[PDB]
């Protein structure tokens, strides 16, 4: 059951891959200015 996960090994792609990409995304996120802007969207990128 759960997310179609009838074998524990299936949890390895479902966690390691989202984390790894997130780590890459972290290198993006730390680069961006994370201050408030008070606008409809943030043009700083």
């Amino acid at each position: 059951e759960a997310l179609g996960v009838d074998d524990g090994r299936l949890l390895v792609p479902l966690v390691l891959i989202p984390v790894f990409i997130a780590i890459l995304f972290s290198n993006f996120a730390s680069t961006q200015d994370n201050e408030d802007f008070f606008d409809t969207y943030d043009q700083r990128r």
Partner: protein, 163 residues
């Protein structure tokens, strides 16, 4: 430019590609390509499918005596109903082909692909600075396809009732 992920995002959302990819295309292209190749392979050489579930298969493949007009990917078996039927949920590949599993595969990947196409039309409209409501127009054939492929089997209780 700033980071590897930033370079990947710039390439994905680039307007310099011959065909725009975008984030919606990141989901659209694999699903559409999978559904396309599975549909071609099934239309050419799929085994007959017991659509009615009473052990009388119906042939819809070219190699089994069909032409272009009479050829089709037969809907899933009535014994399956609307149960999720991937390849790994069948005892054998022959059993999966016999119960109309490729129909479910093509239908699901095609619905994901057309949703991605709606989103990708919006995405390229936003990238080009134009108005975004072409995707609203394209929702109607997508709605019709989902009604004839997904909604009607859900209401009737079996993918065998799908088109």
């Amino acid at each position: 430019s700033a980071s590897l992920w930033e370079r990947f995002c710039s390439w994905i959302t680039s307007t310099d590609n011959r065909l725009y990819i975008g984030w919606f295309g990141v989901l659209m292209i694999p699903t559409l390509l999978t559904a396309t190749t599975v549909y071609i392979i099934a239309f050419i050489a799929a085994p007959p499918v017991d659509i009615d579930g009473i052990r009388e298969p119906v042939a819809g493949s070219l190699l089994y005596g069909n032409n272009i007009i009479t050829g089709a990917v037969i809907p899933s078996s009535a014994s399956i109903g609307i149960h999720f039927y991937p390849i790994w949920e069948a005892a054998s590949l022959d059993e999966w082909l016999y119960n109309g599993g490729p129909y479910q595969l093509i239908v699901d990947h095609f619905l994901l692909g057309v949703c991605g196409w709606i989103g990708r039309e919006w995405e390229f409209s936003y990238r080009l600075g134009m108005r975004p409501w072409i995707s609203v127009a394209f929702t109607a054939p997508v709605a019709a396809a989902s009604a004839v492929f997904l909604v009607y089997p859900i209401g009737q209780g079996s993918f065998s009732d799908g088109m």
